[PDB]
């Protein structure tokens, strides 16, 4: 039977399973409220499917110069064509190779860069903001958006969208590394699943994603949609609460230490964006400091809420396709606030 909604994260997550329910701000209001993040399922349903396809980006803007960032060490890739990045999206035997003859993970940095989205791409640009769920928070305008109505006491959000384009993370050494490393945004965001690329000609690294998965903390209904409903997963999510930004900060200074950083111990580790948790630093950060996070699973069209000032971190398991748009909720704004 349909259903408007059901839990993850064993009742701790929100799951919204209709992305134009008009009465879903009734069921989200209450959670969001809490300071929790909140997943919303079937935006893909809902799109111009062609738009959103790899090969499209490399036809009409393959030409232009661009930056890529190798996940494994963090060295930059200077001017290259945006093509050289997509044409090894899926496909493993035309990805850059680094020294060792491997192909490498790469991201694609600042692209489309700074607020050029909408001028770049205005069909795509239309296609998501009229998909957004919770359309009065997360559109421009939206009656629950303040970043618009906002002075400038207040950290407003640059113009949106921003997209998040990267490979999939493929060895038992990856599972230890980000796609994006742990850090936190000032403002609320959505960030939306638009395509998974489950690659070939090294097709068969399904068993390592499991692992992944497992280790990762995922709860056993995140388990069934893979093997009972074969939906696509992109990437793993942790998530912590923006109370618990100074408890994880205490444990990034304490580690910083123990491998013989040498930091003031004042410095930012999450604002440096330079920490990843694995599953060892998880664990101390849970045994240690009593600090729990959310485990998500952003599968092909899942939207994810990130409340401002919660901590994140970001895994691809396959080739992801990310589209987010900044919003100023009610319920977070005095995260932006620029006075004590
Ligand atoms: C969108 C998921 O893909 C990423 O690169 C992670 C990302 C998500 C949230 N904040 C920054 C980056
Ligand atoms: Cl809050
Ligand atoms: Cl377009
Ligand atoms: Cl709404
Ligand atoms: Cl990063
Ligand atoms: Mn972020």
């Given at each position: 039977s349909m259903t408007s909604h059901s839990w993850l994260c064993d009742g701790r997550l929100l799951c919204l399973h209709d992305?134009?329910?008009?009465?879903?701000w009734k069921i989200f209001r209450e959670c969001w409220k809490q300071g929790q993040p909140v997943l919303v399922s079937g935006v893909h349903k809902k799109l111009?499917?062609?738009?959103?396809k790899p090969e499209a980006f490399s036809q009409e803007f393959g030409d232009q110069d661009v930056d890529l960032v190798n996940?494994?060490?963090?060295?930059i890739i200077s001017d290259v064509k945006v093509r050289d990045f997509w044409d090894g999206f899926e496909i493993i035997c035309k990805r850059l190779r680094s020294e060792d003859g491997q192909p490498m993970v790469l991201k694609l940095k600042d692209w489309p860069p700074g607020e050029d989205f909408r001028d770049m791409m205005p069909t795509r640009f239309e296609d998501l903001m009229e998909n957004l769920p919770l359309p009065e928070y997360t559109?421009?305008?939206?009656?629950?958006?303040l970043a618009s109505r906002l002075p400038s006491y207040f950290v407003r959000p640059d113009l949106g969208p921003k997209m998040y384009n990267a490979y999939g993370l493929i060895t038992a050494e990856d599972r230890?590394?980000?796609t994006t490393n742990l850090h936190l945004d000032v403002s609320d965001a959505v960030n939306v699943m638009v395509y998974v690329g489950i690659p070939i000609?090294?097709?068969?690294?399904d068993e390592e994603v499991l692992k992944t998965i497992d280790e990762g903390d995922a709860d056993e209904v995140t388990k069934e949609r893979i093997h009972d409903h074969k939906e696509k997963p992109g990437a793993l999510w942790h998530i912590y609460a923006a109370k618990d930004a100074e408890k994880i900060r205490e444990l990034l200074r304490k580690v910083g230490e123990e491998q013989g950083q040498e930091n003031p111990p004042d410095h930012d580790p999450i604002h440096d964006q330079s920490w990843y948790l694995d599953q060892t630093l998880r664990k101390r950060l849970y045994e240690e400091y009593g600090v729990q996070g959310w485990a998500i699973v952003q599968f092909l069209g899942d939207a994810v809420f990130i409340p401002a000032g919660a901590p994140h971190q970001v895994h691809n398991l396959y080739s992801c396709i990310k589209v987010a748009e900044d919003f100023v909720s009610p319920e977070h704004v005095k995260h932006c606030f620029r006075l004590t």
């Open positions: 992305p134009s329910n008009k009465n879903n111009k499917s062609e738009l959103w996940c494994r060490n963090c060295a559109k421009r305008d939206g009656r629950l958006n230890r590394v980000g000609g090294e097709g068969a690294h």
